[PDB]
């Protein structure tokens, strides 16, 4: 997270850290969406250009964390995975379209002060909240700058950018399964997700029922926090039908 601040304890209790078993290292962010399901970006699990193709046995999720590096005994919960599901139309070859995956935990987790699920939007929530200029929040233990790492979870609030401005910002082909966020060059505020924040949640708080909803997944960017450039997020609501059918069939 570039130009963010330390998270308050418990401010993102759905934040998950994807963690490699051997070597032991951070791989990506993710989110807790129920007692047994974690949501992340497909490119965190499957990315052929880097010979990345993780199986359930390669990975752990860590939930309830604040420190990036400490083992937070009796606070964090470390879970193995039963199964990984990647969107069947995930497009790694061109633009990361449908950059979404689900991971099912071996056993359901108990919630705690530090561990609790985020909501997924429905039609009504997406329509109300997904508009240019409305701010959401991104969290993660990624790089503090493009070219370094935080001791504790970082947080930054970023505004949604209008779809034409997102498109003009890049020569990569943008689809309706993506949205972008970040401040304009004139706006006197900056901030972005960066390497290691990928897969993590972009969330917004409903003014109607005080609940947090995950509207996006940190997906991709050209650099981190560059003027005229914007972060891209997977559009969760657009892909919600796939999410629902995986959980209904395999849950």
């Amino acid at each position: 997270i570039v130009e963010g601040s330390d998270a308050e304890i418990g401010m993102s209790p759905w934040q998950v850290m994807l963690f490699r078993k051997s070597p032991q290292e951070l791989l990506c962010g993710a989110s807790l969406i129920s007692d047994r399901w974690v949501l992340t970006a497909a490119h965190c699990l499957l990315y052929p250009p880097w010979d990345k193709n993780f199986t359930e046995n390669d990975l752990l999720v860590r939930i309830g964390k604040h420190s990036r590096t400490r083992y937070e005994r009796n606070i964090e919960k470390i879970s193995m995975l039963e199964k990984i599901y990647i969107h069947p139309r995930y497009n790694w070859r061109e633009n990361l379209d449908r950059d979404i995956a689900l991971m099912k935990l071996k056993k359901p987790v108990a919630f705690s002060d530090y561990i609790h699920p985020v909501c997924l939007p429905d039609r009504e929530t997406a329509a109300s909240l997904l508009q240019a200029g409305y701010k959401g929040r991104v969290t993660g233990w990624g790089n503090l700058k493009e070219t370094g790492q935080p001791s504790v979870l970082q947080v930054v609030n970023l505004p949604i950018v209008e779809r034409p401005v997102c498109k003009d910002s890049t020569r990569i082909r943008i689809t309706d399964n993506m949205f972008c966020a970040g401040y304009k060059p004139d706006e006197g505020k900056r901030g972005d997700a960066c390497e290691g924040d990928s897969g993590g949640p972009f969330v917004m708080k409903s003014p109607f029922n005080n609940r947090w909803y995950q509207m996006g997944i940190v997906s991709w960017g050209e650099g981190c926090d560059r003027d005229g450039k914007y972060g891209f997020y997977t559009h969760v609501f657009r892909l919600k039908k796939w999410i629902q059918k995986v959980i209904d069939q395999f849950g």
Partner: peptide, 27 residues
């Protein structure tokens, strides 16, 4: 049931330090 309500914040009627920036953007 109570997805999206944080045990240390909304469940205790406590706001985090920057939440109001988000809500202010929705006006």
């Amino acid at each position: 049931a109570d997805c999206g309500l944080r045990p240390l914040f909304e469940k205790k009627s406590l706001e985090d330090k920057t939440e109001r920036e988000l809500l202010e953007s929705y006006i």
